[PDB]
Design a protein around this ligand. Structure first.
Ligand code: HEM
Ligand SMILES: OC[C@H]1O[C@H](O[C@H]2[C@H](O)[C@@H](O)[C@H](OCCCCCC3CCCCC3)O[C@@H]2CO)[C@H](O)[C@@H](O)[C@@H]1O
Ligand SMILES: OC[C@H]1O[C@H](O[C@H]2[C@H](O)[C@@H](O)[C@H](OCCCCCC3CCCCC3)O[C@@H]2CO)[C@H](O)[C@@H](O)[C@@H]1O
Ligand SMILES: OC[C@H]1O[C@@](CO)(O[C@H]2O[C@H](CO)[C@@H](O)[C@H](O)[C@H]2O)[C@@H](O)[C@@H]1O
Ligand SMILES: *C(=O)Cc1ccc(C(C)(C)C)cc1
Length: 465
């Protein structure tokens, strides 16, 4: 019962504790080189198994899906962490989230328009909004944040907001705008001894100002909903949930309920949506750099959709190249380098070694996204990574931006639809330009850490007509 090959732990300080993305990337390439695709690294009295590349990951997530279906444990004591962390600490709860979203999506087509439809509409308002700029230089960051969020809003709150609407413009900041944290060793030391640091450790100071403001909007939205709830005609996710806890009314569990709800929506709302908004953004940075490929995309749109018909989810199958560009964008955007960690639910043999129950495993997705065994030019934008001999779309075995297995992204589908419609629509209507020349656009992600996010950039949308 030996774990896989690995380096030597350093006691309670950290052999490699505190390294930065670049330093670790260097360390990671070495470890993988020293031990292979499956190695063990030791941290704070615990071993985490690291899976590298297409094969190792697939052997784990897919060939032994259940064994690896455990989600990384989260152990801390706080107020905020306790109440919420618990709600989703269990693996069963995660399943419950899926089980509800799929069934609800199936049985309750809520509001005279399907998902693909609400996205075709949002794109339509985007094209309407993009003209209101009249060819100026703006930052897609907020726009792309708006459109992708509106979708989650529609499906959950039963409506979409207008890009200028304050209730929306402000909610967008609550979730997506970054807050700088200012501290100094001096101040930190003072806080620790007399700081009541146990009370506002790290980021709590900031979150609570958003958390309270958010818990408010939801809380009051749930309320406006519950009062107009036609039990024969639900309108959105919230109604369909209200109808469920109408039995549990006359109990104080409602406070527990409402809280259950808030995170689910935020977790659903921000992590998926933010990732999608970033993917789009990154997508257009690429589009600027490689104008050649941007043209083909446009030319193809023209041969299948034309200049007037709004693009639909059915064109994706008749547009192999544009679909290939979107795969590449996801492969290179690579927003989740290490990927959410797993925990193996039982004593699991793996390539001969033995990973004990609850041994946290890291499926490094980036190592697959860039896996040389599966991509001709692993670090170069190349739509050919996904096109067969006859210019048709072949699947690449190493393409897993949404991870794999039982634990795959609950929004993988809804996301890819957003990506294709938003992309083809924008490009069917507008032409893109930037101050920077393509050959000087740097794609290198600003990498504060824990995720790839592209550098800021201006962009110009020109209506072809
Ligand atoms: C757009 C690009 C997106 C990417 C690259 C992405 C990626 C991922 C990854 C890597 C995971 C976890 C993988 C694992 O547990 O092994 C995940 C899980 C999840 N994602 Fe996303 N996601 C995206 C969009 C979205 C969207 C739009 C939503 C909307 C709700 C969403 C909601 C979720 C949820 C609910 C899970 C839970 C996984 C589980 O059930 O255990 N994601 N996603
Ligand atoms: O058995 C095959 C059937 O299922 C597919 O439709 C699924 C699709 O998988 C898909 O359209 C959807 O699954 C999505 C489940 C998770 C919800 C996605 C997001 C919705 C918004 C909030 C966040 C989650 O549910 C549909 C109905 O269950 C096929 O596309 C259908 O044509 C077919 O009837
Ligand atoms: C009563 O037990 C219910 C609970 O009330 C209920 O919370 C649970 O379902 C949880 C599904 C996940 C909730 C998703 C909602 C989050 C808020 C808005 C979208 C819907 O199912 C249990 C058993 O069916
Ligand atoms: O995330 C995997 C998921 O996407 C789908 C979409 O059909 O995979 C297929 O479709 C893609 C988009 O065009 C291609 O990569 C390819 O045609 C195919 O693998 C799902 O079937 C799958 O579960
Ligand atoms: C974008 O998808 C970032 C992201 C990935 C995964 C998650 C979960 C798995 C829900 C914590 C959040 C945000």
């Amino acid at each position: 019962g030996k774990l896989p090959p690995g380096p030597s732990p350093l006691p309670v300080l950290g052999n490699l504790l505190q390294m930065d993305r670049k330093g670790l990337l260097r360390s990671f390439l070495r470890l993988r080189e020293k031990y292979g695709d499956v190695f063990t690294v030791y941290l704070g009295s615990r071993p985490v198994v690291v899976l590298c590349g297409t094969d190792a990951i697939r052997e784990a997530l897919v060939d032994q899906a259940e064994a690896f279906s455990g989600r990384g444990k989260i152990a801390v004591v706080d107020p905020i962490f306790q109440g919420y962390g618990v709600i989703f600490a269990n693996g069963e709860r995660w399943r419950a989230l899926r089980r509800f979203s799929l069934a609800t999506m199936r049985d309750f087509g809520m509001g005279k328009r399907s998902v693909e439809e609400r996205i075709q509409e949002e794109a339509r308002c985007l094209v309407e909004e993009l003209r209101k700029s009249k060819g100026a230089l703006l930052d897609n960051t907020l726009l792309f944040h708006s459109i992708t969020s509106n979708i989650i809003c529609s499906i959950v709150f039963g409506k979409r907001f207008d890009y200028k609407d304050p209730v929306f413009l402000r909610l967008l900041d609550l979730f997506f705008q970054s807050f700088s944290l200012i501290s100094s060793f001096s101040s930190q030391v003072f806080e620790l001894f007399s700081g009541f640091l146990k009370y506002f450790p790290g980021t709590h100071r900031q979150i609570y100002r958003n958390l309270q403001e958010i818990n408010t909007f939801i809380g009051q939205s749930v309320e406006k909903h519950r009062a107009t709830l036609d039990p024969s005609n639900p309108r959105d996710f919230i109604d369909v949930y209200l109808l469920r806890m109408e039995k549990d009314k006359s109990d104080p569990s409602s406070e527990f309920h409402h809280q259950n709800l808030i995170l689910t929506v935020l977790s659903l709302f921000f992590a998926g949506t933010e990732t999608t908004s970033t993917t789009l953004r990154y997508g257009f940075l690429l589009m600027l750099k490689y104008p050649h490929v941007t043209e083909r995309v446009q030319k193809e749109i023209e041969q299948v959709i034309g200049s007037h018909r709004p693009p639909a989810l059915d064109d994706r199958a008749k547009m192999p190249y544009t679909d290939a560009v979107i795969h590449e964008i996801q492969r290179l955007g690579d927003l989740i380098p290490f990927g959410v960690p797993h925990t193996v639910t039982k004593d699991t043999q793996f390539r001969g070694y033995v990973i004990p129950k609850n041994t946290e495993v890291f499926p490094v997705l980036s190592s697959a996204l860039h896996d040389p065994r599966y991509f001709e030019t692993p670090n170069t934008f190349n739509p050919g990574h996904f096109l067969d001999a006859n210019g048709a779309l072949k699947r690449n075995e190493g393409f897993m931006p949404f991870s794999l297995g039982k634990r795959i992204c609950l929004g993988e589908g809804i996301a890819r639809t957003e990506l294709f419609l938003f992309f083809t629509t924008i490009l069917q209507n507008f032409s893109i330009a930037s101050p920077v020349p393509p050959e000087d656009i740097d794609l290198t992600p600003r990498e504060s850490g824990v995720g790839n996010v592209p550098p800021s950039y201006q962009i110009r949308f020109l209506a072809r007509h």
